[PDB]
Amino acid sequence: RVLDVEVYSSRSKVYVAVDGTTVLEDEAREQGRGIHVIVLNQATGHVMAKRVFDTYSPHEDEAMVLFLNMVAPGRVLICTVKDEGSFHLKDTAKALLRSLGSQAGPALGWRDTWAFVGRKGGPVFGEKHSKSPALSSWGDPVLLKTDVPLSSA
Numbered sequence: 406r407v408l409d410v411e412v413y414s415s416r417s418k419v420y421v422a423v424d425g426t427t428v429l430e431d432e433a434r435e436q437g438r439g440i441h442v443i444v445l446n447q448a449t450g451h452v453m454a455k456r457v458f459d460t461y462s463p464h465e466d467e468a469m470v471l472f473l474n475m476v477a478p479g480r481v482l483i484c485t486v487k488d489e490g491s492f493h494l495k496d497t498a499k500a501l502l503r504s505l506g507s508q509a510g511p512a513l514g515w516r517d518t519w520a521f522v523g524r525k526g527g528p529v530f531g532e533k534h535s536k537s538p539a540l541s542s543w544g545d546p547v548l549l550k551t552d553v554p555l556s557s558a
């Protein structure tokens with residue numbers, strides 16, 4: 406009746422594991438920058454969608470908004486940042502993250518790390534954030550481990 410979800414966000418590496426199986430892993434240098442998004446079925450944990458939005462670059466946040474608005478309210482939503490996800494995370498995307506209940510997403514800053522697990526229509530199940538301490542530095546790697554409830558009946 407529960408999914409064991411692990412989410413890792415850092416300068417050079419992201420991964421997501423569900424029930425001990427890696428469903429997303431990107432450790433490639435110079436690739437996969439931005440916010441990675443995984444959508445899971447809320448009864449089985451099966452992956453319904455996997456995306457990466459390079460929100461360090463213009464226009465990617467608009468694509469993230471259009472994608473997230475089509476996710477059904479019951480789904481499990483997982484986000485994790487690789488390298489930099491804030492430079493072009495603009496106000497409409499931040500407001501959408503705030504509407505999910507995210508505390509750190511709407512405040513994401515330069516080279517911060519961020520891992521998030523929650524139900525599309527609320528509530529948030531787990532969230533971790535590390536603020537970069539200097540423009541030349543990154544946030545500390547964050548490893549979020551969250552038990553996500555499953556729907557049934």
Ligand SMILES: O=[N+]([O-])c1ccc(O[C@H]2O[C@H](CO)[C@@H](O)[C@H](O)[C@@H]2O)cc1
Nearest residue numbers: 435438461487488489490492515516543
């Ligand atoms: O020449 N520039 O305008 C310029 C130089 C460096 C820069 O930041 C560096 O950090 C980014 C975010 O961490 C990385 O994604 C890039 O690989 C980049 O090398 C951004 C712009």
